[PDB]
Amino acid sequence: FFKTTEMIGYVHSIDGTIATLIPAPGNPGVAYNTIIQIQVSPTTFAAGLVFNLEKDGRIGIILMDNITEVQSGQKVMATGQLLHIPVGAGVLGKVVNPLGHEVPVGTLGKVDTGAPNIVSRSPVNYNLLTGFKAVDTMIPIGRGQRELIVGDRQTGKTSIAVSTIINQVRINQQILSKNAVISIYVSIGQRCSNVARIHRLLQSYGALRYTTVMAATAAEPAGLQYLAPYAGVTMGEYFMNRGRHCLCVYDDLSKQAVAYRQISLLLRRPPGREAYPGDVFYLHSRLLERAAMLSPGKGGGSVTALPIVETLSNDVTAYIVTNVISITDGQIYLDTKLFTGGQRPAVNIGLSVSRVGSSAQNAAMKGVAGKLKGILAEYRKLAADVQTIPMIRGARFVALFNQKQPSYFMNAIVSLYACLNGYLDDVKVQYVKFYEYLLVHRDLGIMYGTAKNKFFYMYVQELNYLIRFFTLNSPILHGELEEMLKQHTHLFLQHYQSKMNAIKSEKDVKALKNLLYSCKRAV
Amino acid sequence: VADHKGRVGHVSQVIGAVVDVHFADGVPPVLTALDVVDKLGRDEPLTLEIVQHLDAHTGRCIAMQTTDLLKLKAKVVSTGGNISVPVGRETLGRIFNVLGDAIDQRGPVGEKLRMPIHAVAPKLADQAAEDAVLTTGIKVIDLILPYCKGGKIGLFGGAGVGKTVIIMELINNVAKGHGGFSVFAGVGERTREGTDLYLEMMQSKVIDLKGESKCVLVYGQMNEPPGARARVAQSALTMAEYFRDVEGQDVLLFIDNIFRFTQANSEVSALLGRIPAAVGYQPTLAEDLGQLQERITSTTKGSITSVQAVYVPADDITDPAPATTFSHLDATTVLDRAVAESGIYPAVNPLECASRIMDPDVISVDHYNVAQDVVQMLTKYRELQDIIAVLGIDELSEEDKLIVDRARKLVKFLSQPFQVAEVFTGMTGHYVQLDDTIDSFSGLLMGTYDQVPEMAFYMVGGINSVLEKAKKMAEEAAELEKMRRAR
Amino acid sequence: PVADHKGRVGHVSQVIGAVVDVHFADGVPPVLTALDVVDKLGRDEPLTLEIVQHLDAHTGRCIAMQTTDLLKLKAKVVSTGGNISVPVGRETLGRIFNVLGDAIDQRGPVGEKLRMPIHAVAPKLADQAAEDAVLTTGIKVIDLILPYCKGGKIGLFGGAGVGKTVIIMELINNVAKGHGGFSVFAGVGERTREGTDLYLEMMQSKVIDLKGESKCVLVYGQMNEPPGARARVAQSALTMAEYFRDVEGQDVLLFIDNIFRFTQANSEVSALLGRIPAAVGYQPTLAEDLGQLQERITSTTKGSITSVQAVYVPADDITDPAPATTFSHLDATTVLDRAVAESGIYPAVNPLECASRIMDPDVIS
Amino acid sequence: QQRTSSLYNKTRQFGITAALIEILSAMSSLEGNAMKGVRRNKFWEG
Amino acid sequence: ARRVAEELHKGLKELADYTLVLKTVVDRTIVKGFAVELAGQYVNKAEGQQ
Amino acid sequence: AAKKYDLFGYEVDTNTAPWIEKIKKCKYYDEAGEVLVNMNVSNCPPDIATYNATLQCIYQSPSKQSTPVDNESKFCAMMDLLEEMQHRNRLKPNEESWTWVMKECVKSGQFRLGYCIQQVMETECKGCPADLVKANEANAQKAKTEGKEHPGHLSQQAGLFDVKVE
Ligand SMILES: Nc1ncnc2c1ncn2[C@@H]1O[C@H](COP(=O)(O)OP(=O)(O)OP(=O)(O)O)[C@@H](O)[C@H]1O
Ligand SMILES: Nc1ncnc2c1ncn2[C@@H]1O[C@H](COP(=O)(O)OP(=O)(O)OP(=O)(O)O)[C@@H](O)[C@H]1O
Ligand SMILES: Nc1ncnc2c1ncn2[C@@H]1O[C@H](COP(=O)(O)OP(=O)(O)O)[C@@H](O)[C@H]1O
Ligand SMILES: [Mg+2]
Ligand SMILES: [Mg+2]
Ligand SMILES: [Mg+2]
């Protein structure tokens, strides 16, 4: 009736965030990749992970907490079990460490599980709306998919992922909790301030109710930064194995590799390319293979991965960047030149790809995306090599793609539809955003008393699901949509563009410039 | 020390995926398989493969599963031989792993024989000369770099250029109607891709669960440890060898990706006490790959048509792994990212591809002459492109512009929509016959279609489809002119 | 309280460069502990060591803050009972200090109320601030493209002789002199003459009133100093700023020049410690060292610290691990290019490669 | 042509140096990890 | 400590025939109480500085 | 009666009667989704009957959860459920499913969605329950009398410089 632990040896050496243990003669011994407790005091313990088992009997330990309290000669107890962390709906809206300890703000899941089997998966057929027109059309993302986000520093890698998490808030509030998308945001080696700013940002939009944060700041030891992705996905596998869908964001894997390199070199592992350990590909490979779309027989749950990766001078020939690209089912490449050129998000469509394809798009978006894709392809070639419809409509498509906040599906699809069917041909490129703003947040037909539609109005947000069911090219919805956009175009051109083209005063010119720039950041 | 079956040893060292085992009676022979009999509270069995002998009693080994919950001095028992995999027609329609255990959850498999995954390659006297064209239904491959039955084919490419898609198209065009059997080896690739392949094969009735199947699947993927990814290729190759020798059948062998076999061995090389070579690969890169490749060959007993996909890291074809694989192939298909970015699929660079059967003795004289003329025209067009870039198209002579106009049509006419990429392209695929391709290109070279619009050759099949698309282009253009006329 | 290891006696066992191993019969003290060499050794100055690793239960590896000349084996060493502590409070204002906290201005004794250790834990999540505002520097490029944030972190990446030091002096003149709060100048691996020039400039401007109240503290470990000192002067200077921020709730300016030498110093010792080098040749713990240091340089709910750090880019290679890792730890990044300077444009800021976090309409107009 | 040639000749020199450094680092790591065992020789008869 | 050691000895079946011996060790990490270790089974009934 | 098989050929449980009873005993319609989740986990794919029961619970339930949820809408949940059934399960909604949607639109006063559903039933199904069509028209004409035909801010006259772009 005693709480007898399993002492296995003493602490021999300490080198920063790692340690070595010498086993006491005639003791049970410790198992590989298990957790151990270093008795820094008769009541206080520091967590460590077994990494090496040498011929001499010495044991390599990766420290996780209370490092400053660790001294040579202290006792070590072996739990004899792998790493398990709390998982469940009770963790949502909280900030936690890779070990599961909650971080104050101003069921147990195993961290080393195997990925689903080949016959335990199903084809990706359910879309995951990021909220950005560029991605949702040209770079579809489906639940159970791994979509890399690769770019240079200060290009929107973090903002886009956060926006994707936020865009699910409105959807989750309406539909049943069955189809709601939970979020696990994992910060690795980032500043503590940035985590707090992200936490406040999510709280403002109410995303904490469906989101949890796992933080391993820079000040924390490399061990936590090394385990954060595995702990984060584990929290997301709880929902996957129970018929629910999750979205795991890793910000970012580049700093995880550094931590793993730091641990390996200190523990006397042979270096490899760029001093990284030989098994650096296998690290990310087993991390991202755990994100899948389970088959109907196992529940239908899924985990969607959005690992983030940083390059130097737009060099995608680096080591870890190449490995991650060869693992994920697609990549979103954020280009520095486009970012400084005013294109935001700076998604380079040419270098971006989604291997799932149209299967991860709703029936409503398939038709718009397919035709849009051909127009842009021609537009890229025409300018590279005469006001053709392809070149007129392509420029306005690019102008529409600029955004600052995620867009509701109904608003985005109906704007793309309009630009696709030539409704914006008479509209100048500079005024496209202003045209979109009036279409979404206003109704010219009602303003001028020329609206004869019965149900199809942009202020009826419930129409999003009807559109997502029947398609915009269906008899139920096609006619009213065309009339709505036909009245909107005529009213907009007559009452707004005519005055806008007639402005010459410096005061009026400056006022118009502010308006159009604001419209970019509004819709 | 002849029969080591049941010999006992103890685990002495564990570092990552490499484990050292001590035997009091002497270490078993290299490549021997060992089972961890000790009860360590693991959810999966642990098996090791001996790769080195440190001394007369100690042996270094690579594990096939994760080494979690493994303690020192843990008991280990030899299996009496190398890793064995089931063989025979009873494996058809089934999915296996590196160890030869079914993972399709479709019940026990009736195995009458098992064979070791490690075998000696055929000797020189066991080589058969088979020079016969293989019709894949693809204009580019059939024309510039025709494939040979019983030969070796490589698909060198970066990431996202279309290596996997081409393999799917080849399966759909060559395997459905194949007389013999097929073996697909997934090595260090995405698990979902294997799942999609399994569904497609079942739909195409290649794998008939109720009836008779004609293909086997062997999957060791990214999630698996490096030990499994370094032996799954051997396992599948062993199955194909049995079909070649014992059954005397003509078999297809698809491998995706063969590079992962090299990558996995490099990962473990550091822990085996081997100094890294250039770039960072293991010093045994050339020899290890050679032993495997030589086993993939057609002998006097049977024939193996091998299609292997090679990953060129960072689009660097000077890398040791892609380069080392070029000398072990009969037909190389080099894919280029620049071609793909221009909307041309498959993104094949004909100026870098090669084929062994591109000789008049093997193929028809017309086929050889047409292919050479195409290559020469493409080469010249690239040189003229520099002048078009600097001087401009105006300054080119009459002859040069005719080359330019004809060559551009060739570039777009090489593109072809595949039947498996309908979702990506949104259009039905085409299967072009060998004769149709030769005639279509022959007419194009001599200017029989100089008046046809350039875009009529883009993403189409034979010449007939070109004419139909041109007619459709003319009709829509006329409608646009009529609309403008009314305005 | 009193440490249980104070007065503990050890003997030198191994000497290699600035790295010394000490064997204690009763047990090696805790890591980061400070030790003093008692044997005279004919040295001209005292010898102090800081423990950084534990080789065994009795042996510990340490870095010397002064030169290890005339150091023999079996030399006697005594533990000080705690980490390296430095003075804090208003008594330090108007004074010049070194890594050990000893005044080097040849003036009267500091007479500090207390001392605090250089090594300390960083502010936690709940103790982080959420205030964004523009610090007007008077420079056109900075105020327009990459505006600085009050209480934020600013970095000036540049090569050799590009203008990093000049911009810092301009910022000091345009901000520090007209600053209500306090200022701390941390010289790390920089020219000793520059410190002298700064000290004269601060006296002439009467930011240091030798007879009155001063607003600036100087902490200097320069190029001539051994690697051990250059790897800890930043910690000591940061510790003084932390005290002003928290214990007094006072706004602080922290001018660090140059932060790259800190990483370089840790690299030199790491090579001697027997660690496998990472890419280029830097220590494997490059990122962790910066993370621990930078995370302490932040604005909490009690006070604010506006930090300006000069970063030296070796061989003008901005991809070097040292400067590359520092980008993620800075709110504002100011990249200087040699070619721009050669064109007669000063400052040589390359606006395309620069960035700021407050470039948000929600913050700026 | 004179500016891109220098960067090409400067790159090859750096590439050779770095690759060689990597290999030697691995060589030193595998040498450091190695430990010599007790010498089983007739020490008394010396 | 002797009573705890005997109780631990009884629990261990392997050490049924082994003779119990007690060896005292001084640990500066504990200010009050004691701890007992036997064949890897560790029982802590001690407290340190608060 | 006839064994069903899944995508990979494995058999699926078809006895989905107990689950329907569980659905018909829920208080808040969000609990219904949990039952559907449990069915999928147990390899018991829902049939057309199960979805209709879920729609019935949504229409007859007071609210989504015990505590209010911002921007909750019964219509949105049911339409999403139908989207899942038709697209991700390959099951055609019957007349009963659409009638439940029309009842919810009438009950909630959303008279514009009723018009769209009315056409859907007149297009896919055979007409609409004339009781519900008349009820929707009554709601629409009530808005015309009270003036709540469209949100008022839309009717406010604006200009090029008279629009506040947030
Ligand atoms: N769509 C956008 N439109 C306008 N500004 C944007 C957009 N996305 C991001 N930004 C801004 O660009 C800057 C960089 O964004 P972000 O923090 O996402 O970069 P990042 O990829 O995380 O870079 P790093 O983390 O290395 O600093 C921020 O000021 C952010 O507000
Ligand atoms: N703003 C400036 N206006 C004019 N000249 C400048 C300016 N900034 C720098 N210079 C010139 O560049 C020289 C070097 O500047 P500075 O002392 O700032 O170098 P640095 O960036 O500190 O480099 P390092 O400290 O490594 O020598 C100055 O002596 C001066 O000649
Ligand atoms: N025939 C094709 N037509 C159109 N796109 C293609 C084609 N083949 C490949 N692609 C592109 O490449 C993607 C698939 O890449 P994949 O075949 O997996 O290449 P790899 O395995 O070499 O990375 C598709 O999603 C599409 O973007
Ligand atoms: Mg970021
Ligand atoms: Mg592939
Ligand atoms: Mg300077």
Which H, E and C letters describe chain C, residue by residue? CCCCCCCCEEEEEEEECCEEEEEECCCCCCCCCEEEECCCCCCCCCCEEEEEEECCCCEEEEEECCCCCCCCCCCEEEECCCCCEEEECHHHCCCEECCCCCECCCCCCCCCCEEEECCCCCCCHHHCCCCCCEECCCCHHHHHCCCEECCCEEEEEECCCCCHHHHHHHHHHHHHCCCCCEEEEEEECCCHHHHHHHHHHHHHCCCCCCCCCCCEEEEEECCCCCHHHHCCHHHHHHHHHHHHHHHCCCCEEEEEECCHHHHHHHHHHHHHHCCCCCCCCCCCCHHHHHHHHHHHCCCCCCCCEEEEEEEECHHHCCCCHHHHHHHHHCCEEEEECHHHHHCCCCCCECHHHCEECCCCCCCCC
Q: Which run of H or E residues covers position F12?
A: strand F11-12
Cα–Cα dist A230/B223, whole Å: 13
Sign of CA dihedral B47, B50, B51, B55: positive
CA D8 to chain centre: 25
In the reported structure, the alpha carbon of residue C170 is separated from the centroid of ligand 2 by a whole-number distance in angstroms of 11
Please count the other Cβ atoms lying within 10 Å of the Cβ belonging to residue A478: 15
A53/B72 CB distance under 8 A: yes
Closest CA to C331 of C306, C356, C314: C356
Do chains D and C meet with 3 or more Cβ pairs nearer than 8 Å?
A: yes
Cα–Cα dist C214/C206, whole Å: 8
CA B123 to chain centre: 24
Judged by its nearest atom, the ligand closest to the C-alpha of residue A162 is: 1
Closest CA to B415 of B352, B354, B357, B350: B350
CA A505 to chain centre: 46
Radius of gyration of chain B (CA): 26
The C-alpha angle with vertex C41 and arms to C35 and C45, in degrees rounded to 5, equals 65
A302 lines ligand 1 (CB under 6 A): no
Query: Could you give the C-alpha distances from F56 to F78, F100, F106, in angstroms and in order?
Result: 10, 7, 15
Cα–Cα dist F98/F119, whole Å: 11
Cα–Cα dist A64/A111, whole Å: 15
Sign of CA dihedral D28, D32, D33, D38: positive
Sequence-distant (6+) residues with CB within 8 A of A303 are A144, A233, A236, A237, A239, A240, A245, A246, A247, A248, A290, A291, A292
To probe the interface with B, which of D24, D28, D30 has the most B CB atoms within 10 Å?
D30
Q: Which run of H or E residues covers position B303?
A: strand B303-311
Cα–Cα dist C242/A432, whole Å: 51
Cis amide prior to B346 (ω within 30 degrees):
yes
SS3 B414: coil
Question: What is the DSSP pairing of strand C9-16 with strand C134-135?
Answer: unpaired
Closest CA to A424 of A448, A402, A399: A399
Sign of CA dihedral F93, F95, F100, F106: positive
CA B94 to chain centre: 20
Provide the residue type at C47 as one letter: L
Could you give phi then psi for residue C52, rounded to 5 degrees?
A: -125, -20
Ligand 3 atom showing the smallest separation from residue B311 Cα? 22
Sign of CA dihedral A86, A87, A93, A95: positive
Buried b (16+ CB within 10 A) or exposed e, B235-258: bbbbbbbbbbeebebbbbbbbbbb
Closest CA to C327 of A262, A228, A190, A220: A190
Q: Which residues of A touch F164 (CB under 8 A)?
A: none
Q: What is the DSSP letter of A495?
A: I
Q: What is the DSSP letter of B89?
A: G
Q: Are the C-beta atoms of B188 and B220 separated by less than 8 Å?
A: yes
- Tell me which residue has tokens 């947040």: A441
Of A121, A269, A355, A468, the catalytic one is A355
Q: What is the DSSP letter of A259?
A: H
Specify burial of residue A150 (Cβ count, 10 A radius: 0-12, 13-18, 19+). Answer: buried
Cα–Cα dist A77/C38, whole Å: 39
Cα–Cα dist A71/A121, whole Å: 48
Please tell me if residue D28 touches chain A, with a CB cutoff of 8 Å.
no
E41/A5 CB distance under 8 A: yes
Q: Are the C-beta atoms of B231 and B49 separated by less than 8 Å?
A: yes
Please give the biggest Cα pair distance in chain E.
Answer: 42
CA C101 to chain centre: 13
Cα–Cα dist C296/D9, whole Å: 43
Query: Which token pair is A149?
Result: 């986000």
Q: Out of B105, B199, B209, whose CB is closest to F7? A: B199
Could you give phi then psi for residue B435, rounded to 5 degrees?
A: -65, -40
Q: Are the C-beta atoms of F40 and A296 separated by less than 8 Å?
A: yes
Q: Are the C-beta atoms of C209 and C87 separated by less than 8 Å?
A: no
Sequence-distant (6+) residues with CB within 8 A of C334 are C142, C146, C154, C155, C156, C157, C167, C349, C354
In the reported structure, the alpha carbon of residue B159 is separated from the centroid of ligand 3 by a whole-number distance in angstroms of 9
Sequence-distant (6+) residues with CB within 8 A of C56 are A12, A13, A72, C28
Provide the residue type at A354 as one letter: S
Cα–Cα dist C22/C63, whole Å: 11
The neighbouring-strand residues paired with C22 are C12, C60
The yes-or-no answer on residue A355 being catalytic is yes
Give the distance from residue B94's alpha carbon to the nearest chain F alpha carbon, in angstroms. 13
Radius of gyration of chain E (CA): 12
Cα–Cα dist C90/C182, whole Å: 10
Q: What is the DSSP letter of A494?
A: I
SS3 B430: coil
Cα–Cα dist B58/B292, whole Å: 27
Query: Which token pair is B282?
Result: 């293991």
Cα–Cα dist C152/A86, whole Å: 35
Cα–Cα dist B174/B252, whole Å: 9
Cα–Cα dist A472/A484, whole Å: 13
Buried b (16+ CB within 10 A) or exposed e, A372-381: bbebbbbbbe
**Which regions of E1-50 does DSSP assign to beta strands (E)?**
32-38, 41-47
Residues in chain B, total: 487
- Tell me which residue has tokens 């080994």: B61
A189 lines ligand 1 (CB under 6 A): no
Question: What is the DSSP pairing of strand B8-15 with strand B18-23?
Answer: antiparallel
In the reported structure, the alpha carbon of residue B368 is separated from the centroid of ligand 3 by a whole-number distance in angstroms of 30
Query: Which token pair is A242?
Result: 């129970």
Q: Which residues of B touch A381 (CB under 8 A)?
A: 342-343
Q: Are the C-beta atoms of A195 and A213 separated by less than 8 Å?
A: yes
SS3 B154: strand
Cα–Cα dist A165/A186, whole Å: 12
3-state secondary structure labels for all residues of A335-383: CHHHHHCCCCCCECCCCCEECCHHHHCCHHHHHHHHHHHHHHHHHHHHH
Closest CA to C313 of C168, C187, C160: C160
Sequence-distant (6+) residues with CB within 8 A of A389 are A422, A425
CA A515 to chain centre: 31
Please give the biggest Cα pair distance in chain F.
Answer: 69
In the reported structure, the alpha carbon of residue A236 is separated from the centroid of ligand 3 by a whole-number distance in angstroms of 29
Cα–Cα dist F57/F104, whole Å: 11
Cα–Cα dist B56/B54, whole Å: 7
Given resolution (angstroms): 3.7
Nearest 10 degrees: CA dihedral of B480, A133, A481, F114?
A: 160
CB < 8 Å from A in window 171-210 of B:
188, 190-192, 194-196, 198-199
The neighbouring-strand residues paired with A218 are none
D23/B279 CB distance under 8 A: no
B273/D30 CB distance under 8 A: yes
SS3 A150: strand
Radius of gyration of chain A (CA): 27
H-assigned helices in chain F: 17-23, 30-41, 48-60, 74-87, 95-108, 111-123, 130-146, 152-155
Sequence-distant (6+) residues with CB within 8 A of E1 are E22, E34, E36
- Tell me which residue has tokens 């739990």: A79
Closest CA to C188 of C130, C136, C231, C144: C231
Sequence-distant (6+) residues with CB within 8 A of A250 are A186, A188, A229, A232, A256, A287, A305, A306, A307, A308
Query: Could you give the C-alpha distances from A220 to A188, A234, B111, C71, C270, in angstroms and in order?
Result: 10, 20, 54, 36, 20
Query: Which token pair is B334?
Result: 């080099």
Cα–Cα dist C269/C36, whole Å: 19
Provide the residue type at C56 as one letter: D
Could you give phi then psi for residue C321, rounded to 5 degrees?
A: -55, -35
Sequence-distant (6+) residues with CB within 8 A of C332 are C146, C147, C148, C149, C152, C153, C154, C155, C355, C356, C357
Q: What is the DSSP letter of B83?
A: -
Please count the other Cβ atoms lying within 10 Å of the Cβ belonging to residue A482: 16
F80/A179 CB distance under 8 A: yes
The C-alpha angle with vertex D39 and arms to D38 and D42, in degrees rounded to 5, equals 135
Cα–Cα dist C219/A46, whole Å: 35
Assign residue A416 a region: left if phi > 0, alpha if psi is -120 to 50, beta otherwise?
Answer: alpha
Cα–Cα dist A470/A478, whole Å: 10
Q: Which run of H or E residues covers position A250?
A: strand A245-251
Q: What is the DSSP letter of E44?
A: E
Radius of gyration of chain D (CA): 22
The neighbouring-strand residues paired with A108 are A86
Cα–Cα dist C119/B187, whole Å: 50
Question: What is the DSSP pairing of strand A95-96 with strand A211-216?
Answer: parallel
Cα–Cα dist B16/A283, whole Å: 12
Question: What is the DSSP pairing of strand A211-216 with strand C216-221?
Answer: unpaired
Cα–Cα dist F81/C332, whole Å: 48
Do chains F and C meet with 3 or more Cβ pairs nearer than 8 Å?
A: no
Laid out side by side, the sheet with B250-256 consists of B95-96, B215-220, B182-187, B250-256, B303-311, B152-157, B331-334, B354-355
- Tell me which residue has tokens 């051997």: B234
Cis amide prior to A252 (ω within 30 degrees):
yes
Cα–Cα dist A48/A60, whole Å: 9
Please count the other Cβ atoms lying within 10 Å of the Cβ belonging to residue E17: 5
Query: Which token pair is B418?
Result: 């595949």
Sequence-distant (6+) residues with CB within 8 A of F88 are A125, A126
Query: Could you give the C-alpha distances from C26 to A39, A352, A430, C5, in angstroms and in order?
Result: 20, 63, 79, 9
Residues with Cβ–ion distance below 5 A, ligand 4: A 158
